């Protein structure tokens, strides 16, 4: 079971060479029900994920 304090620290921040960024993996993985994470974000800041690339919108819930 995976937990994330702030998903902004994964996608809003983060070098490509320092770990997961907006350009790393888990994008075509989270179509499948292989990996089970539990995140926590706030609404008006979660609107940055929609306007970022509009691709995590249908991968997270």
């Amino acid at each position: 079971i995976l937990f994330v304090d702030e998903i902004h620290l994964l996608l809003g921040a983060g070098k490509a060479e320092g770990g997961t960024d907006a350009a790393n993996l888990l994008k075509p993985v989270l179509s499948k029900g292989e990996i089970k994470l539990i995140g926590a974000t706030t609404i008006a800041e979660y609107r940055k994920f929609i306007e970022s690339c509009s691709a995590f919108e249908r991968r997270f819930e």
Binding site: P28, S31, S54, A55, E57, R58
Partner: protein, 55 residues
Amino acid sequence: LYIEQFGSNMNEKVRNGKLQGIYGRDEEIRAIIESLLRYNKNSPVLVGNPGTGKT
């Protein structure tokens, strides 16, 4: 002869039966295949509204 696992294999996973039986848009499938047999251009791209099936 090649290792072939630099990305991931796609045929052998459906040979295992994990992804059998896909309901199909047959006009969409043949749009790929006719782009696949050309002498000059051999690269289709499934541009689409992000919700739909691409994979």
